């Protein structure tokens, strides 16, 4: 009957509290059948724009191991994640390369993430002295200096704490609402490919 086994996209998508933007939890996924049909439905997940491979061909030309990331970002920064646009959150927190396979998944989370008291546990970076290459993380929290003089110490003028916060009160409209972007990455490294979709009958 060719009965199969699964690997947790239920942990990837239906987790309780996601990670922050500056330290996004990269998860490697191997040795599966990859049921993307749950991912394919446009009713739970509003945005499924794909760049490397088509959504129709996702159950073919299958890959070695896939990389699942995570985000909680505002609705005005979802378009920014995709390659070709540089801004303030895909330039210093998550740089995507010009040609890559795999694609973003964005859905609203006003019920699960927006708290009336507040949600100051999401942090991001908008000052960095250097820039980003594709696909690294910057967990370190040294104080950014905007001037020639060594400012240092507490956060004064031209000292900046580089980890700034979101504000997720539910009074805000569409545009500042948490859109939990999960971006997949597909790679074809020289190895026996073992993440490949369910053919069944």
């Amino acid at each position, epitope marked *: 009957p060719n009965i199969t086994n699964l690997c947790p996209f239920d942990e990837v998508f239906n987790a309780t509290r996601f990670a922050s933007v500056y330290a996004w939890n990269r998860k490697r996924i191997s040795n599966c059948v990859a049921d993307y049909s749950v991912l394919y439905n446009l009713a739970p997940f509003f945005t499924f724009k794909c760049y490397g491979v088509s959504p129709t061909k996702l159950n073919d030309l299958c890959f070695t191991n896939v990389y699942a990331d995570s985000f909680v970002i505002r609705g005005d920064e979802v378009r920014q994640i995709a390659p070709g646009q540089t801004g303030n959150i895909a330039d210093y927190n998550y740089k995507l390369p010009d040609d890559f396979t795999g694609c973003v998944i964005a859905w609203n989370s006003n019920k699960l993430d927006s708290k009336v008291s507040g949600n100051y546990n999401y942090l991001y970076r908008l000052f960095r002295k250097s820039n980003l290459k594709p696909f690294e993380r910057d967990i370190s929290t040294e104080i950014y200096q*905007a001037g020639n003089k060594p400012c240092n110490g507490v956060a004064g003028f031209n000292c900046y704490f580089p*980890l700034r916060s979101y504000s997720f009160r539910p009074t805000y409209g569409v545009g500042h609402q948490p859109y939990r972007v999960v971006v997949l990455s597909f790679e074809l490294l020289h190895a026996p490919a073992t993440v490949c979709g369910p053919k069944k009958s």
Partner: antibody, heavy 120, light 104 residues
Framework: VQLVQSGAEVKKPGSSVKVSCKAS????????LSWVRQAPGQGLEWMGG????????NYAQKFQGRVTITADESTSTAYMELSSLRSEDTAVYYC????????????????????WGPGT | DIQMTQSPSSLSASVGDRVTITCRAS??????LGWYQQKPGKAPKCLIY???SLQSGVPSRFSGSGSGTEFTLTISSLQPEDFATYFC?????????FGQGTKV
């Protein structure tokens, strides 16, 4: 959030001027507060900023030490002493919060608060 | 402290013209230029936050652009209350600069 401030002050030279503005409505003492001059025949000009929670002060060019700025977070009032007045140094004065970075709980409010005074 | 320069103040245009107000700095700052509309005898008002990002509560006839040192504001179509003066603010480093200029 609104800013109120006092009326017209001394014009005759040789004296020093106290001008103060108070943040009325949602008293926030973390964001940077700035002073802006405007002449009838000249554009806007920046002289100095104040952090009310820390008390650090940064000034403009060529008149560091002429400007003294005092902050009090308890009464939510910010004071401004400027000495050595000229006849050509007259301008209408504004206080503003044009920098959206809070130093207390790491928040960066994007709008820049649109904070401006009435103008005296 | 770096200075900024704008276009000269002699801009005069009718209703329905393309506007190309320039604003240039002397050091490669990312996007931190703001623009403020000032009417005579009135407090200023923000129009756009920083480069393309636009302030809430205004009509969408305004746009901004620029990534290096050259910075532009563009009006899509003019309005009867367009008669004003527009200022650049540096942000980023603290000594700052107010770039001046008017449009009649």
């Amino acid at each position: 959030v609104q800013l109120v401030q006092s009326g017209a002050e001394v014009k005759k030279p040789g004296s020093s001027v106290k001008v103060s503005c108070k943040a009325s409505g949602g008293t926030f003492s973390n964001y940077a507060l700035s002073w802006v001059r405007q002449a009838p025949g000249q554009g806007l000009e920046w002289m100095g900023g104040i952090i009310p929670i820390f008390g650090t002060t940064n000034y403009a060019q060529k008149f560091q030490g002429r400007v003294t700025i005092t902050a009090d977070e308890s009464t939510s009032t910010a004071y401004m002493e400027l000495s050595s007045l000229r006849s050509e140094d007259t301008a209408v004065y504004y206080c503003a919060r044009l920098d959206g970075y809070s130093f207390g709980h790491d928040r960066y409010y994007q709008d820049g608060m649109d904070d401006w005074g009435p103008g005296t | 402290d770096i200075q900024m320069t704008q276009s000269p103040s002699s801009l005069s245009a009718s209703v329905g013209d393309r506007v190309t107000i320039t604003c240039r700095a002397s050091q490669a700052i990312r996007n931190d230029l703001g623009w403020y509309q000032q009417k005579p005898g009135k407090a200023p008002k923000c129009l756009i936050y920083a480069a393309s990002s636009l302030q809430s509560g205004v009509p969408s006839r305004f746009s901004g652009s620029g990534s290096g040192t050259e910075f532009t504001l563009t009006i899509s179509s003019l309005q009867p209350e367009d008669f004003a003066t527009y200022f650049c603010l540096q942000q980023n480093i603290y000594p700052r600069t107010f770039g001046q200029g008017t449009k009649v």
